[PDB]
Amino acid sequence: AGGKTGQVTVFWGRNKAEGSLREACDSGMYTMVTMSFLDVFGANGKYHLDLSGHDLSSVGADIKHCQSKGVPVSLSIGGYGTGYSLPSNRSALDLFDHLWNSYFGGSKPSVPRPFGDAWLDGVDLFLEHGTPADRYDVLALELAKHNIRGGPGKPLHLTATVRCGYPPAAHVGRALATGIFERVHVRTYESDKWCNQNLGWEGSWDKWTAAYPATRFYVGLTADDKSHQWVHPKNVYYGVAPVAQKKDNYGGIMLWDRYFDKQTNYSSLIKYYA
Numbered sequence: 001a002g003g004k005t006g007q008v009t010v011f012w013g014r015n016k017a018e019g020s021l022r023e024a025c026d027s028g029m030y031t032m033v034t035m036s037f038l039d040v041f042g043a044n045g046k047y048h049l050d051l052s053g054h055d056l057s058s059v060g061a062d063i064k065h066c067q068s069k070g071v072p073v074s075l076s077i078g079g080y081g082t083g084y085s086l087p088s089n090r091s092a093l094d095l096f097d098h099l100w101n102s103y104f105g106g107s108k109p110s111v112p113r114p115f116g117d118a119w120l121d122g123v124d125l126f127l128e129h130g131t132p133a134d135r136y137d138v139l140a141l142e143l144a145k146h147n148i149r150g151g152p153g154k155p156l157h158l159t160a161t162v163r164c165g166y167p168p169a170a171h172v173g174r175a176l177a178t179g180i181f182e183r184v185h186v187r188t189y190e191s192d193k194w195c196n197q198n199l200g201w202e203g204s205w206d207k208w209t210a211a212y213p214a215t216r217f218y219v220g221l222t223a224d225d226k227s228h229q230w231v232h233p234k235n236v237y238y239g240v241a242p243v244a245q246k247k248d249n250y251g252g253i254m255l256w257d258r259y260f261d262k263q264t265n266y267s268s269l270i271k272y273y274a
């Protein structure tokens with residue numbers, strides 16, 4: 001049976017008023033910060049990073065500062081938008097190259113590095129949109145092969161942030177089928193009828209965790225106390241946390257997002273139940 005792990009992953013980059021990345025890591029509330037989102041990519045070779053107006057000039061320094069404090073920083077690709085797809089093996093490999101040379105251990109004269117010499121700690125796949133033609137499995141495998149634990153490089157935490165419902169959309173299922181994802185953040189705060197904190201998340205949680213034994217599962221909760229899917233701390237303590245932790249592959253809690261958490265201080269208590 002699983003149990004508390006003390007792990008709390010939070011999303012950052014959705015609202016410039018949420019403070020700098022450095023501030024997030026300095027709060028001592030998170031064990032991982034995931035920036036969002038690289039929202040444009042595909043078979044045409046055009047890539048875009050959208051951090052909602054945040055000052056990009058200081059992100060590199062903040063990333064390194066976070067890492068020095070033991071807080072890894074990841075980059076989520078995708079999002080709720082419609083500007084991305086990965087319809088071929090070639091497009092998947094080109095995206096890997098772009099990520100590698102722009103944010104990780106790669107270096108190419110023609111490719112600028114948004115955060116300078118900072119080297120990110122992971123990649124999260126937030127694939128709201130996709131088709132059976134997408135090849136996220138090819139991208140995932142390449143990223144997994146660069147998760148080095150005993151050689152020239154550093155660990156790369158490969159994750160996916162998915163909808164509550166099981167089974168997942170085909171393109172997500174194809175990627176997860178590789179079996180090499182380290183963590184999956186199951187969003188239980190979407191309005192999805194039959195599958196959210198109000199009703200059905202537990203059943204889906206059972207299916208998700210059982211289907212991917214090698215992957216650690218995080219319960220995704222919203223820090224927006226105005227949401228109909230918000231879970232009061234006392235209900236996380238006596239309900240959500242205990243139930244989620246019954247599974248052997250429970251990994252922790254994911255929070256959406258830094259902005260909301262900053263306004264409600266949700267993690268102040270939640271980090272103790274994770």
Ligand SMILES: *[C@@H]1O[C@H](CO)[C@@H](O)[C@H](O)[C@H]1NC(C)=O
Pocket residue numbers: 089138
């Ligand atoms: C694309 O990659 C997948 C997985 O490696 C492979 O099964 C498929 O044959 C590839 N498509 C081709 C033939 O380029």
Ligand SMILES: *[C@H]1O[C@H](CO)[C@@H](O)[C@H](O)[C@H]1NC(C)=O
Pocket residue numbers: 263264265
């Ligand atoms: C949570 O703590 C912060 C500390 O700065 C405080 O500003 C905030 O008002 C608190 N949350 C509430 C009750 O709004």
